[PDB]
Amino acid sequence: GHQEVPAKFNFASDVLDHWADMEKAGKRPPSPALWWVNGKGKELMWNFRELSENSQQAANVLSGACGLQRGDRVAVVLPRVPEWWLVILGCIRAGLIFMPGTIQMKSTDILYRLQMSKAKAIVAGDEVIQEVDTVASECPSLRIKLLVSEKSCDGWLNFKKLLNEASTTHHCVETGSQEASAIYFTSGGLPKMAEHSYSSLGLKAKMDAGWTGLQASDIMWTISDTGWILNILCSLMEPWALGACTFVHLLPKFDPLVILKTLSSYPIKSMMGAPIVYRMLLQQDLSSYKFPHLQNCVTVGESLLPETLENWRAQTGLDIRESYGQTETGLTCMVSKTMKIKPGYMGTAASCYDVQIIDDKGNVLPPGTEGDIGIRVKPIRPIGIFSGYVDNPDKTAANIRGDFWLLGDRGIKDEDGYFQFMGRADDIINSSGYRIGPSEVENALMEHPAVVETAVISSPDPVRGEVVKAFVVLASQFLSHDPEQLTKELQQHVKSVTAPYKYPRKIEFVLNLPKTVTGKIQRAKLRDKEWK
């Protein structure tokens, strides 16, 4: 379709500079925008005027000292240091396409991203420059290497010193609402470049703002890798749309006790994290570290188990409000602060998204019927949807069904419009003309004492083309058991707790299962290998 958006939009000029201006005018006291701590005694805080000044300095470093021009792509690979926030704002101000990536990336990942994006610059931290420098020389478009570090390195520009020398006045580029602001690499096959516009990030953020329950004089802590689109949406835009403060902890180790201590030691009122953050915190006896100031707990990235919600309510007296989204769509469904929580449901449509469950032809289905979760993008493409996969309109096309952008997830919608996540459509198993969800099978296997962990996928079958296969991590108590007899026992066990057509006709015992950094089982990785 197409959009109904203002011609121009820029988050820095249209949002952040408002708050800076308000301070300058005495219309609001100097208010914290960014509070950073390293957990080792170093803290730093910018009010909105200082944030504006310092990010105008960043824009000047980038546009002036490094000569990056409007439309230039800037890889950003930083830990959780304030310079990530300054650099991203710097790019927004200067009209540069920022391309965030994780500080954990290896040189192969870096080479692929730099080459695929034809990035003209990389802004990197100490911890990744050795990896970058192994491959930087094979990226002919890469002209600028900006290092954020307390030290200098030959061949790298010293960002922090350049920042200090830069002018605090930068004329914000009058960016178009639909002009490219960022590229986030997915994994859809090989990683795709999801391009977002100034409006699909910033304007959408402005419209979503406060769904978390955050208010103007509050502090939000989003716990995120700086490379994840979560970081732009919730660490940067949500609080700043509201003129609230974003709290950032270096959090060099994902240390649940550091997290608890932090929540307990700072006046943090809202937090966002992946469900694993909450499950980890629940592995603590939270009771030595009360956090009475915390009011709002939100989560995205994985299904929030009803048990986790229950057990967080138990221990903290707080809700966890779930949200749902992907790189291409940002915040798609959420439980906002005023909405009742339905355990196992991820809420209702964002923000002028029309989210529906749709059938294989693209028709809206009635409540209670499983289909494909989609966002209506015809006749009008809503604000918040990405602009397309860069250099790949076919892959963008392939994900549109009728009037709908397919998220790739199955779902059901209840009577009040709440969505229940029913798994990745690509994880459904097609055996002997039956569709089989892996979750029921995995859940079945999990009831058995021998099974500590399991992942159920398709396996190519001689006789039936595709079969149900289970990878199982054994309880140590069953390591001694006969693999063949145990295999028949588990199948007998599944045949007997679910429709027998669902049972795993193959079982492989493994010592671990591949998982994301947020602890999600990577079934596609297992399925890939499993098909030669």
Ligand X SMILES: CC(C)(COP(=O)(O)OP(=O)(O)OC[C@H]1O[C@@H](n2cnc3c(N)ncnc32)[C@H](O)[C@@H]1OP(=O)(O)O)[C@@H](O)C(=O)NCCC(=O)NCCS
104 is in an annotated binding site: yes
User: Considering CB distances under 5 to 8 angstroms, the limit depending on partner class, which of ligand X, Mg ion, none binds residue 520?
Assistant: ligand X
| Contacting residues for 362 by C-beta, under 8 A, at least 6 apart | 374, 401, 402, 403, 404
Per rule CB under 5 A, count of chain residues that contact Mg ion: 1
Told to check if 395 binds ligand X by CB under 6 A, we report no
Told to check if 215 binds ligand X by CB under 6 A, we report no
User: Considering CB distances under 5 to 8 angstroms, the limit depending on partner class, which of Mg ion, ligand X, none binds residue 264?
Assistant: none
Q: How many helices (H) and strands (E) does the chain have?
A: 18, 27
Told to check if 53 binds ligand X by CB under 6 A, we report no
> Which CB atom, from 212 or from 326, has the smaller least distance to ligand X?
326
Told to check if 372 binds ligand X by CB under 6 A, we report no
* Window contacting ligand X (CB under 6 A); options: 136-144, 362-370, 476-484, 515-523: 515-523
To Mg ion, the closest distance from the beta carbon of 500 in angstroms equals 21
To ligand X, the closest distance from the beta carbon of 163 in angstroms equals 30
191 is in an annotated binding site: yes
Hey, how many other C-beta atoms are within 10 angstroms of the C-beta on 429? 21
**CB contact at 8 A, 408 and 426:** yes
Runs of H (alpha helix) within 253-409: 256-265, 275-282, 306-316, 393-398
Token reading at 318? 């707080």
Task: Compute the C-alpha angle 484/489/493, nearest 5°.
Answer: 150
> Which CB atom, from 380 or from 473, has the smaller least distance to Mg ion?
473
Say if residue 505 is exposed, middle or buried (CB neighbours under 10 Å; 0-12, 13-18, 19+): middle
DSSP labels, 305-317 = -HHHHHHHHHHHS
* Window contacting ligand X (CB under 6 A); options: 78-86, 136-144, 204-212, 325-333: 325-333
Out of 451, 456, 467, 521, the only residue in the binding site for Mg ion (CB under 5 A) is 451
DSSP state of 380: B
User: Considering CB distances under 5 to 8 angstroms, the limit depending on partner class, which of Mg ion, ligand X, none binds residue 451?
Assistant: Mg ion
192 is in an annotated binding site: yes
To ligand X, the closest distance from the beta carbon of 257 in angstroms equals 23
Told to check if 235 binds ligand X by CB under 6 A, we report no
Tokens 């140590």 correspond to: 476
Return the beta strands (E) in 86-210 as ranges. Answer: 97-101, 121-125, 144-148, 157-158, 180-185, 193-197
Query: What whole-number distance in Å separates Cα of residue 493 and Cα of residue 449?
Result: 11
Told to check if 52 binds ligand X by CB under 6 A, we report no
**CB contact at 8 A, 473 and 451:** yes
Told to check if 470 binds Mg ion by CB under 5 A, we report no
Query: What whole-number distance in Å separates Cα of residue 228 and Cα of residue 236?
Result: 12
User: Considering CB distances under 5 to 8 angstroms, the limit depending on partner class, which of Mg ion, ligand X, none binds residue 235?
Assistant: none
φ, ψ dihedrals at 317, nearest 5° = 75, 5
> Which CB atom, from 286 or from 474, has the smaller least distance to Mg ion?
474
527 is in an annotated binding site: no
Told to check if 264 binds ligand X by CB under 6 A, we report no
Told to check if 442 binds ligand X by CB under 6 A, we report no
**CB contact at 8 A, 144 and 157:** yes
Told to check if 322 binds ligand X by CB under 6 A, we report yes
Told to check if 472 binds Mg ion by CB under 5 A, we report no
Told to check if 399 binds ligand X by CB under 6 A, we report no
Decide: helix, strand or coil at residue 270: strand
147 is in an annotated binding site: no
- CA proximity to 284, closest of 261, 265, 251: 261
Site string for ligand X, 327-366 (x = CB under 6 A): x------------------x--------------------
> Which CB atom, from 295 or from 303, has the smaller least distance to ligand X?
303
Told to check if 324 binds ligand X by CB under 6 A, we report yes
Query: What is the binding site for ligand X (CB under 6 A)?
Result: 186-187, 300-303, 322, 324-327, 346, 407-409, 421, 424, 516, 518, 520
Output the known binding site for ATP: 186-192, 322-327, 409, 424, 520
